Amino acid sequence: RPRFSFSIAAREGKARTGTIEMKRGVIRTPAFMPVGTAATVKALKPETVRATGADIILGNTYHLMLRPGAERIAKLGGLHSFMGWDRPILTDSGGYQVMSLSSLTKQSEEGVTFMLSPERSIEIQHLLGSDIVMAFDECTPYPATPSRAASSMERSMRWAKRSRDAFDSRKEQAENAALFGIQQGSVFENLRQQSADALAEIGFDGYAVGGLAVGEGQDEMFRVLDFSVPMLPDDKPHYLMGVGKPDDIVGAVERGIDMFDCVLPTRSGRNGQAFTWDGPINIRNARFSEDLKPLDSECHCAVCQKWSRAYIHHLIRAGEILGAMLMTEHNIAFYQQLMQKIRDSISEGRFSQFAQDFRARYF
Amino acid sequence: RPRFSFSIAAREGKARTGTIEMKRGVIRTPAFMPVGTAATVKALKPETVRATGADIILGNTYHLMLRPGAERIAKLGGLHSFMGWDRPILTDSGGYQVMSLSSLTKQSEEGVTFMLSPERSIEIQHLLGSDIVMAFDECTPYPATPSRAASSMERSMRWAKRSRDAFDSRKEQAENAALFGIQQGSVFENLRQQSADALAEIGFDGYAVGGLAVGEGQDEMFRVLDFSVPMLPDDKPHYLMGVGKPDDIVGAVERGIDMFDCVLPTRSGRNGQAFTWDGPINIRNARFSEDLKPLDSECHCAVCQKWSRAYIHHLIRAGEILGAMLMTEHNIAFYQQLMQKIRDSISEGRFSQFAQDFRARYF
Ligand SMILES: [Zn+2]
Ligand SMILES: [Zn+2]
């Protein structure tokens, strides 16, 4: 396969379905990437992640650069070998979690100390053996004044250029991995446009829409996506970082998004929330104590093929590890099934109808 | 298959190897039973438990009678259906954990309130759908004076008779399940003899050697087994309750034991202890941070086929669920491999040599 090749097979309105071919495998789009925190998709073996239908996973960098360490993972053979996932892996820049999980943070034009700079971020992702490298930037806080949103976006664009050059200066990385730039600008159209133009000028393999997983509310997110996605190069993948609620995904795809990631499936799974076509349920609720039906009546996952809600209800309330394992497998499978239905409906030119039907039942 | 049929295929000294045929499957002896607390072998799907080589698992009763409840599990279709394990299951009487996990316990000749009686215990195991039912007794504390050991043993024998009658009064249970009596008597030979005679007089499908997983030290346990096991009927299975350290198992088999169970493999696994032929290791130790070798160099389990000690070291130190899953699968597989080596060496008449070789390396 080539280093990177995104091809669009079918369209409907702003929605697209196709594939991204990379050295370690093919990624079907629109795609959902399970999140792997600390070199593991919580409670799941990689074979199980693959079994659910995942083509690629997201590897959090912040955690790995600290524990066990980027240089160490490299010495050990890379993240793929380390965790046992031989397919594509997209890594975040690690800058986000720095401004959320660390302390005494000191930001400057050079980078952030807590010294993670654009150059070091790219190098860390290189050491991890990332297939899709994310440019290092700043996820603008919400809400943000136009002045502050502009300053952060402008800085991120300067960092986008530095990320590009750092990535290109490393032969092995430039020839085997891909680089995505990130659009910033908060909820302001003029800033989003300036960011999109700056990114396109630099040139990237893919474009992410950053700064929209900040609790602005679905309506606002959709409004921003309405004018933001069209600004990005049409022939390259569009990645909406950190977005994952089922209805959010459907609406984003309707607006031109090709890639997604979020901890909702995994984290909520361990907390007792199971996704179903009739909306999410909290398996811990007493009404499931003697419910022999599977988590979801139509789901084709192994969990719904073998265990009842009653059993999983028992497991979660007892704090049993198998509870987390089963809820997580089902939720990730549910997400992958959602992406499959989305891809097929688009290919068949009935995605708009699918979106309508999905919402009517889910709500 | 028949309700119950134990056949001895080969012998060497006091050691025996054979099979126990039951309606839900065949059990190869000597056998190790993984412990399922709260209707689950912690951190493992039943298919994984089976994959390691387990023919039967032990279902703790105390927990299930409280949560989710015996009548409820029955209503839901039984423990097998509930947890997804369709092979034999041996259930403890639940009386042990009562004197360890509850409070304001009140013991009498009728039973124990915290009202679990011999009759209720048998009924609970029936509701759970147990294949091998354990008589309800009292696990004599260690150390114990001869007077106290005798009183407890005598009471347990009266309860053994009550357990037998309760089991026999229920047609469905008497025709599809088996009943094991438990030898008590602390470390006193005369009491062990009296208990063995009382049990044999009543008649059971199997005989357990109870009261020896109380921290008396291996030497003392072996000394007691030396004269205790020969007292039990030779043509029925001999079950050493709660014993599981690898070297303990080998020594017990050398003394006539056919069945074992213990939480060591699972519990220690989650705590970071991994069993290897060269002795146990604590994967959390810094010396494994960059060790690319599998948990054990010879182990044929899936974990040793795919992941390094370095990765598992990372997982456990990070408190990741996959860490518990991997350590547990390996440890249970290691135990099953130990039982396989024991069975084969006995069948080949070289068990004594195997025992010697095992100890030399393990220590
Ligand atoms: Zn499912
Ligand atoms: Zn192993």
Experimental technique? X-ray
CB-based burial, B345-360: b 16+ in 10 Å, e otherwise: bbeeeebeebbeebee
Residue to test with chain A: of B37, B40, B42, B303, most A Cβ within 10 A: B40
Q: Where are the beta strands (DSSP E) in chain B?
A: 4-12, 15-22, 25-29, 31-33, 35-36, 57-59, 89-91, 106-107, 112-113, 132-134, 178-183, 206-209, 238-240, 259-261, 273-274, 281-282
Identity of the residue numbered A121? S
Phi, psi (5° rounding) for residue B69?
115, 140
First to last CA, chain B: 42
CATH number of the structural domain spanning residue B239: 3.20.20.105
For residue B270 the two structure tokens come to 């989650």
Preceding amide of B30 cis, omega within 30? yes
Cβ contact A306–B84 (<8 Å) = yes
| A89-91, strands of its sheet edge to edge | A31-33, A259-261, A238-240, A206-209, A178-183, A132-134, A89-91, A57-59, A35-36
A219 catalytically annotated? no
Cβ contact A68–B289 (<8 Å) = yes
> How far apart (Å, rounded) are the C-alpha atoms in residues B114 and B102?
6
For residue B239 the two structure tokens come to 């079950």
| DSSP codes of every residue in A176-225 | H-EEEEEE--TT-HHHHHHHHHHHHHH--SEEEE-S--SS--HHHHHHHH
Residues of A in Cβ contact (< 8 Å) with B315: 38-40
> How far apart (Å, rounded) are the C-alpha atoms in residues B273 and B287?
14
B205 catalytically annotated? no
Identity of the residue numbered A205? D
Shortest distance, CA A75 to any CA of chain B (angstroms)? 8
Cβ contact A306–B42 (<8 Å) = no
> How far apart (Å, rounded) are the C-alpha atoms in residues B275 and B290?
19
> How far apart (Å, rounded) are the C-alpha atoms in residues B251 and B257?
9
Domain range enclosing B170: 1-363
> How far apart (Å, rounded) are the C-alpha atoms in residues B135 and B17?
25
CB of B24 closer than 8 Å to CB of B88: yes
CB of B332 closer than 8 Å to CB of B54: yes
Shortest distance, CA B37 to any CA of chain A (angstroms)? 9
| DSSP codes of every residue in B60-84 | -HHHHHHTT-HHHHHHTT-HHHHHT
Q: How many C-alpha atoms does B176 have within 13 Å on its Cβ side?
A: 13
> How far apart (Å, rounded) are the C-alpha atoms in residues B138 and A251?
63
Of A79, A69, A192, the closest CA to residue A133 belongs to A79
A137 DSSP assignment: -
**Cα angle, residue B183 at apex, residues B179 and B185 outer, rounded to 5°:** 155
Q: Which residue of B has its CA nearest to A306?
A: B84
Ligand 1 centroid distance, CA of A328 (Å):
9
> How far apart (Å, rounded) are the C-alpha atoms in residues B159 and B117?
9
Phi, psi (5° rounding) for residue B206?
-155, 160
For residue B73 the two structure tokens come to 């599990």
- Breaks following residues of chain A (C-to-N distance > 2.5 Å): 114
| DSSP codes of every residue in A228-296 | HGGGS-TTS-EEETT---HHHHHHHHTTT--EEE-SIIIIIHHHTEE--TT--EETTSGGGTT--S-SS
CB-based burial, A84-102: b 16+ in 10 Å, e otherwise: bbebbbbbbbbbbbbeeee
Ligand 1 centroid distance, CA of A307 (Å):
9
For residue A280 the two structure tokens come to 């999410």
CA B168 to chain centre: 24
What are the binding residues of A?
A: 92-96, 137, 184, 211, 299, 301, 304, 330
Cβ contact A82–B290 (<8 Å) = no
Cβ contact B290–A39 (<8 Å) = no
CB of B185 closer than 8 Å to CB of B191: yes
In sign, the C-alpha dihedral spanning A148, A151, A155, A160 is positive
Of B215, B243, B238, the closest CA to residue B141 belongs to B215
CB of A198 closer than 8 Å to CB of A175: no
Residues from A in contact with B at Cβ < 8 Å: 38-40, 42-45, 67-68, 72, 75-77, 82-84, 289-290, 292, 306-308, 310-311, 314-315, 317-318, 320-322, 324-325
Helices B246-253 and B351-362 cross at an angle (nearest 10°) of 160
Q: Which among B92, B131, B248, B258 is annotated as catalytic?
A: B92
> How far apart (Å, rounded) are the C-alpha atoms in residues B49 and B41?
8
> How far apart (Å, rounded) are the C-alpha atoms in residues B215 and A339?
55
For residue B180 the two structure tokens come to 């094991």
CB of B232 closer than 8 Å to CB of B196: yes
CB of B259 closer than 8 Å to CB of B30: yes
CB of B139 closer than 8 Å to CB of B153: no
Residues from B in contact with A at Cβ < 8 Å: 38-40, 42-45, 67-68, 72, 75-77, 82-84, 289-290, 292, 306-308, 310-311, 314-315, 317-318, 320-322, 324-325
Dihedral class, residue B94 (left if φ above 0, else alpha if ψ from -120 to 50, else beta): left
Residues of B in Cβ contact (< 8 Å) with A45: 322, 325
CB of A8 closer than 8 Å to CB of A69: no
Residues of A in Cβ contact (< 8 Å) with B306: 84
Max CA-CA distance within chain A?
A: 61
Q: H or E stretch including B308?
A: none
In sign, the C-alpha dihedral spanning A353, A32, A249, A303 is positive
For residue A270 the two structure tokens come to 């361990």
**Nearest CB to A290: which of B39, B76, B324?**
B76
Residue to test with chain B: of A321, A327, A329, A330, most B Cβ within 10 A: A321
Residues of A in Cβ contact (< 8 Å) with B309: none
Secondary structure (3-state) at A346: helix
Secondary structure (3-state) at B56: coil
- List, as ranges, residues with CB under 5 A of the ion ligand 1: A 295, 299, 301, 303-304, 330
Per-residue CA distances from A267 to A32, A170, A273, A276, B80 (Å): 15, 36, 9, 16, 29
> How far apart (Å, rounded) are the C-alpha atoms in residues A299 and B144?
57
Secondary structure (3-state) at B224: helix
> How far apart (Å, rounded) are the C-alpha atoms in residues B88 and B3?
11
Phi, psi (5° rounding) for residue B149?
-65, -40
Domain count, chain A: 1
The ligand minimizing its distance to the Cα of A295 is 1
